[PDB]
Design a protein around this ligand. Structure first.
Ligand SMILES: Cc1cc2nc3c(=O)[nH]c(=O)nc-3n(C[C@H](O)[C@H](O)[C@H](O)COP(=O)(O)OP(=O)(O)OC[C@H]3O[C@@H](n4cnc5c(N)ncnc54)[C@H](O)[C@@H]3O)c2cc1C
Ligand SMILES: Cc1cc2nc3c(=O)[nH]c(=O)nc-3n(C[C@H](O)[C@H](O)[C@H](O)COP(=O)(O)OP(=O)(O)OC[C@H]3O[C@@H](n4cnc5c(N)ncnc54)[C@H](O)[C@@H]3O)c2cc1C
Lengths: 607, 607
C-alpha cells in the first residue's frame, strides 16, 4: 500500500494491557468515551494515515512549496492540500481539543497515540493542523474578550504559528529584539524580523492564521522575563462575527530550502516592515510572555518527540517487510558450501541484530511517550499510577526532554539500521527510508536543540525540582527490580539504575562545587547530553521489561496465534535491550565520573 | 566554496609521524623529493577548493538526466567543467605506473592527494578512476591486452566495475550474467547488471572500459565459476586506439538516489538490444573473482578515504561556524541575564561536539595513511621494518577498517557537525546536509558493513592465523610500554587493547564451538560489526596518542604560533579520545562475551 506502516496493535497493548488507560474511559471527564470507541478511533486514523495522508508524502518532498514574492505567500503542491482536506474533513485537527471548542474529550495518552499515525505518514500535515490546539492555548491564557476570538479561531479552523526565533536569537530566546509599541487604543504595533517560522504561510488551506508572537514592549527589561506574547492575525477580522477583513502587516519574505520536511513551509516572517503595521493584542492583557509561550513550547516538544518515534517505527516496519522477502546468501551454518540453499536475509545474524535493535528502540520509545502522556492528565495519573496532581506535573516535566531529546537523537540514529537493512536499495528514493532520515534530522534542532533539552532536564527538571520527579521514577524502577524468567533482565536493570544514579550524583557534585570553583560547572555541560541519553536507555529498558512481564502473563494464560507471536517478541526485545544496550551505561558512568576541563582550557586556535 | 582542506594535518602524518619522506628520492621514488610532494598537496588542495568544489552543489541540485532512447546521460555543465580541470592537471593519473604516464609515488602520498578531490566533489574522483582501472587491467592482461590498457590509460578512458545484479549484490557468486564463447576466442556477454557507477558519463571520455563479471556457459556455480571480461563501450582499433563501432552494452536506467546524485548509477544491459556485447577474457584465463578483487580493494580504499575526507570538511565547516556564531551567555554566568553573549565555542557541549568531530576526523586520517604505508613494500620496509609478505597481510587486515569503520564513523559524526550549526545546519545553504546524504552510500557500496566485518574476522584474522593482527597489537603494546605525560592515555589504551583482544578471543571461541554445535557460529555474526568498530576505535586511539607523542616532542623543542596551536590540539584530541571513546570498549567486550542465540531462535513472526 503506502509508505506508512502503522502499529495500532502495539499502541493498544501499551494503552490497555500495560498502562491501564481503559480504567478511566467511561468515567468523569471521559464519561462519553469507552474502550471500544477508543480502539475504533485509533484504527480509523491509522487507515486515514496509511491512505490519503501518506498518499502525498513523496509528492510534498519532490515538488516542494514555492514562495511567491509577487504576493508574499507560499503555494503548496495540490496532492498535499488534498491530504490536508482529508484530515480536516474527518475532524482530526480537533484531536483532544476542549469540548467547548468542539473537541472530543479523551486522555492525552490516547490523543498522542492518534497523532502518531499522522506524524508517521506525513508529519508536516499534523504541523499545519496544529491551529485549533494553539487557539485553545490562546483561549486558556486570554482575557474574556480574547476567549471569544479564540473560540472563533478554533471553530473556523484557522492555522497558527509560534513565533519566537530571530536571526540572532534561537537557543537564547531572551536575546530577541522584535519590539512592541503600545497604541492609543490599547493594541500594539509589532516590529521586527523572525526566522525559521513553521507554517508562516500555508497557501489557501485556511481563511486566517493566528501568529503567536514574542516581542519586547518598549522600555521592558532584558532577557526572557522582559518578553510579552501577542495575538497577531494574518487578516484583521470582526471580533464578534469572525468575518475576515483587511490584511495585517505580517508577511513571509522567504521560504527555506531544507534537507527534509520540505512540504512544511519554514519562513522568514517580517512584522511591520512592508508599509502597514502588524497589529497585535497582548495575550491575557498581561506581560508574561515566556511563561505563556512555554505552554506552546511544551506541546511542540511532545510533538517532535512523538514524530521521531513515529518515523522510526514505520522505518523499522518497512525494513522488516523488505528483509522477509529479500533472498541473499546462504545460511551462516553453511557458509563454506557454495551450493547451499539461498536464504532470506532475516536468517543472517547481523540482520536479526539490526532488526531487533530497530524493534527494541521503536517500541521502547513508544512506551516512553505513552508513559509520559499518562502524567499529562491528573485523572489518568491518579487512576493508573496513584500519583496526585502536583507530582504528575513534575514527572511529566521530567519526561518531556526525554521524549524530545532522547527520542529525536535515537530515532535518527536507528533509522541508519533501517536503511542498511535494504542494502544498496536503501540509498534509493524508490524506498521511503532515505526521506525518513532527512525528515527526521530536524527533530534534534527545532523546539530546542538536544543540548538545550539536556540542560533543561538536569538544571530545571532535576536540580530545581529537588529530585522529586526523578526519585519517584527511580522508585518505580526499583520496585520492578525487587519483584524468574526475568531475573537476568532485572539484574541488568539494577546495574543500569545504579549507573544513572551515579551519573546524577557526579554531575550534582560538579554543579555544587561550582559555588567555590566557577569552571566546575563546565563538567555539568560536558556530561549533560550523555546523561539525558542514559536516562532514556534506562527508561526504555525498564518499560520493555514491564512489557515482557505482561507478555509472560498473557502467554501463561494461553495466548495463541498472532497474539502469541507479538508477546514472544516483547520478551525477546526486553532481553536483547537489557543485554546489548543497558551495559554501556556502566562505561558512560565511569566516563562522567572522570570528566575534566582540559577541553575547556584548550585555546580555540588549537581545534 | 564548501570544501575546507587540511594539508597541514596530511603533512604532519606523512612526514612527522610516519616518515614517508624517508623513501622520497630513493629507489622507485628517486625523482620525487619531499619538497615536490608538499607542493603537489598544496596544488591539488587549491584546485579542489576552487574549480572542483565549484560544482559540488550544482551536481546535486541539477543532477544527470537519462535519455532512454540514446542510452546516454547528460551531466550538468559546471560538473563537466570541474572534470576538465581535473584532467588538465593530470589528477586522474595520480599514482599511475610510469610506463602508463603516471608519476611514481608512495600510495600514502597518492591517497592524501586524492583525499582533496573526494572532499571537494567525490563523484569527480569516481568518474576519474578509469586510468587506475586500466592499470589493473594491464597488470592482469596478456601482452596484447597490455597494449590496449596502455592506450586506454593514455587516452584517459573511463571505466566501470560491473558485478551487481538484482539478485546478486552481497552474494556475488549468485550472478547469472552469461558469457558465450565465439570461434575466434572472443565472448558474447548476456545479462542485466544494476547499480553500476559511471556506466555512462556523457561526453567526458571517448570510451569506457567495462570490467564485467560473467559466468562462461557450463562453468560451475559460485564466485569460483566467474570470469572477468574487458567489454568496451565502443569497439576500437587495437593498434591505434581509433574509436570504432558501438559495442552492445547499453545503460537502460539511472537511479534516483539519496545523495551522490551526480554519479550516474546505472542498470547496464549486455547483449539485450540485438547487438552482441563482445568481451575479451581478461588475461585469457578463467580467474574472475580473484582478478576483480584487485578492483574491489581499490574501491574499498577509495570509499573509506571518501568518508574520512567528507567528515574532515564537515568538521572544519562546523568549527568555522561555531567560531563566529554568538549565542547565549557563558555557563559560568548562566543565571545572570545581563551577562555578555559569547560565541558558541565557549559552551561545553559545543566543545565536546567539536573535539569529538576533530578526534574522529584526525584519527581516521591517520588510519588510512597508516594503512597506505603498508601498500608499498619499500615504504613498509623503510618506515616500519616489515617485509613484503607481512606488509600485504597488514594492508589486508586494515582495509575493512578503512572501509567499514571509516564509512560508519564519518556518517555518524557528521550528525555532530550538522548539530553545531543549530537550525541552520538543516538548510541546504550549508553543505553538511549534502555531506550526510552523499556519505550514506559509503556503508553500502563496495560491500556492506556486515560484509566488511565478516571479511575482517574470517579472512583477515582467522584465515591469516592472526599474524597481521598480532603484529598490530604488538606495536600498540610497544607504545604502551614506552615522559609520563601520556601515562593516563597509555593506561586507557592498555585497557582498550585487552578489551579488543578479549573480543577476538570470545568470537574465536564461538567459532571453535561451532565444530560441536553449528549454531554457535551465529554468535560470531552477531558480534562481528561491533568487533570491527572496536578495532577501529582502538587504532584511532593509538594513532592519535602516537601523534600526541610527536606533538609533545615538537612543543618541547620550542614550537610557536600556529604550529604550537596545531600540536596542542593533537595532545587534546588524543587525551579526549582515550578518556571519552576508549572506555566504552570494556562494556562492548562484556556484551560480546555474553551473546546468545535467543535472537536467532525467535520466530520471524515475532518481529
Ligand atoms: C550508489 C551505488 C553504487 C554502486 N556501484 C556499484 C558499481 O559500480 N559496481 C558494482 O558492481 N556494484 C555497485 N553497487 C552495488 C553495491 O555494491 C551493493 O548494493 C552492495 O554490495 C549490497 O548488495 P545489495 O544492494 O543487493 O544488498 P543485499 O546484498 O541484498 O543486502 C541487504 C542486507 O542484507 C545484509 N546481508 C546480505 N548478505 C549477508 C550475509 N551473508 N551476512 C550478513 N548480512 C548479509 C546486508 O548487509 C544488508 O544489510 C552500487 C550500489 C550503490 C547503492
Ligand atoms: C525546520 C525548522 C523549523 C523551525 N520552526 C520554528 C517555529 O515554528 N518557531 C520558532 O520560534 N522557531 C522555529 N525554529 C527555530 C529553532 O527553534 C532554532 O533553530 C533552534 O532553537 C536552535 O536555534 P539556532 O538555529 O539559532 O541555533 P543556535 O542557538 O545558534 O545553536 C547553535 C549551536 O550552539 C549550541 N548552543 C547554543 N546555545 C547553547 C548553550 N547555551 N549551551 C550549549 N550549547 C548551546 C546549540 O545546541 C547548537 O549546537 C525552526 C527551526 C527549524 C530548523
Amino acid at each position: 500500500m503506502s509508505h506508512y506502516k502503522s502499529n495500532v496493535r502495539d499502541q493498544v497493548f501499551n494503552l490497555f494491557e500495560v498502562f491501564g488507560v481503559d480504567k478511566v474511559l467511561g468515567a468523569d471527564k471521559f464519561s462519553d468515551l469507552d474502550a471500544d470507541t477508543a480502539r475504533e478511533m485509533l484504527t480509523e486514523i491509522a487507515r486515514l494515515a496509511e491512505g490519503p495522508i501518506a498518499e502525498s508524502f513523496v509528492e510534498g518532498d519532490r515538488n516542494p512549496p514555492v514562495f511567491d514574492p509577487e504576493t508574499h505567500t507560499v503555494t503548496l503542491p495540490e496532492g498535499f492540500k488534498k491530504s490536508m482536506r482529508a484530515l480536516f474533513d474527518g475532524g482530526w485537527d480537533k484531536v483532544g481539543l476542549a469540548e467547548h471548542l468542539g473537541g472530543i474529550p479523551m486522555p492525552r495518552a490516547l490523543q498522542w497515540a492518534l497523532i502518531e499515525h499522522i506524524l508517521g505518514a506525513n508529519p508536516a500535515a499534523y504541523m499545519y493542523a496544529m491551529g485549533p490546539g494553539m487557539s485553545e492555548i490562546f483561549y486558556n491564557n486570554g482575557t474574556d474578550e480574547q476567549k471569544k476570538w479564540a473560540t472563533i479561531a478554533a471553530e473556523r479552523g484557522w492555522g497558527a504559528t509560534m513565533v519566537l526565533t530571530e536571526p540572532d536569537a534561537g537557543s537564547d530566546v531572551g536575546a530577541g529584539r522584535t519590539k512592541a509599541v503600545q497604541q492609543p487604543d490599547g493594541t500594539w504595533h509589532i516590529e521586527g524580523v523572525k526566522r525559521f517560522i513553521t507554517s508562516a504561510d500555508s497557501d489557501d488551506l485556511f481563511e486566517n492564521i493566528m501568529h503567536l508572537v514574542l516581542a519586547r514592549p518598549e522600555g521592558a527589561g532584558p532577557g526572557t522575563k522582559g518578553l510579552s506574547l501577542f495575538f497577531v492575525p494574518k487578516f484583521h477580522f470582526d471580533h464578534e462575527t469572525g468575518e475576515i477583513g483587511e490584511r495585517n502587516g505580517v508577511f513571509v519574505t522567504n521560504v527555506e530550502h531544507k534537507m527534509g520536511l520540505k512540504v512544511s513551509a519554514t519562513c522568514e516572517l517580517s512584522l511591520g516592515q512592508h508599509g502597514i503595521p502588524a497589529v497585535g493584542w497582548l495575550v491575557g492583557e498581561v506581560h508574561n510572555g515566556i511563561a505563556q509561550m512555554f505552554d506552546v513550547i511544551e506541546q511542540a516538544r511532545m510533538m517532535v518527540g512523538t514524530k521521531a518515534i513515529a518515523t522510526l517505527s514505520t522505518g523499522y516496519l518497512n525494513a522488516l517487510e523488505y528483509a522477509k522477502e529479500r533472498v541473499q546468501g546462504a545460511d551462516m551454518t553453511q557458509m563454506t558450501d557454495k551450493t547451499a540453499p539461498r536464504v532470506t536475509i532475516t536468517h543472517h545474524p547481523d540482520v536479526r541484530r539490526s532488526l531487533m535493535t530497530q524493534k527494541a528502540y521503536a517500541e521502547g520509545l513508544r512506551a516512553i511517550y505513552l508513559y509520559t502522556a499518562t502524567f499529562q492528565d491528573a485523572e489518568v495519573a491518579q487512576a493508573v499510577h496513584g500519583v496526585d496532581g502536583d507530582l504528575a506535573a513534575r514527572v511529566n516535566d521530567l519526561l518531556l526532554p526525554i521524549v524530545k531529546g532522547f527520542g529525536s537523537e535515537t530515532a535518527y540514529a536507528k533509522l541508519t539500521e533501517s536503511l542498511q537493512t535494504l542494502g544498496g536499495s536503501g540509498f534509493l528514493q524508490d524506498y521511503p527510508i532515505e526521506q525518513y532520515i532527512r525528515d527526521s534530522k530536524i527533530d534534534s534542532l527545532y523546539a530546542g536543540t538536544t543540548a538545550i533539552q539536556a540542560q533543561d532536564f538536569f538544571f530545571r527538571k532535576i536540580i530545581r525540582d529537588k529530585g522529586q520527579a526523578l526519585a519517584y521514577v527511580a522508585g518505580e524502577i526499583e520496585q520492578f527490580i525487587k519483584n524468574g524468567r526475568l531475573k537476568t533482565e532485572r539484574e541488568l536493570l539494577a546495574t543500569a539504575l545504579a549507573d544513572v544514579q551515579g551519573m546524577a550524583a557526579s554531575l550534582t557534585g560538579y554543579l555544587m562545587a561550582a559555588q567555590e570553583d566557577a569552571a566546575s560547572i563546565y563538567k555539568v555541560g560536558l556530561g549533560s547530553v550523555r546523561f539525558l541519553m542514559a536516562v532514556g536507555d534506562l527508561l526504555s529498558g525498564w518499560l520493555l521489561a514491564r512489557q515482557a512481564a505482561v507478555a509472560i502473563e498473557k502467554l501463561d494464560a494461553g495466548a495463541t496465534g498472532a497474539d502469541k507471536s507479538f508477546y514472544e517478541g516483547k520478551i525477546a526485545a526486553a532481553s536483547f535491550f537489557a543485554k546489548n544496550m543497558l551495559p554501556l551505561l556502566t562505561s558512560t558512568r565511569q566516563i562522567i565520573e572522570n570528566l575534566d576541563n582540559d577541553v575547556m582550557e584548550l585555546d580555540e586556535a588549537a581545534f
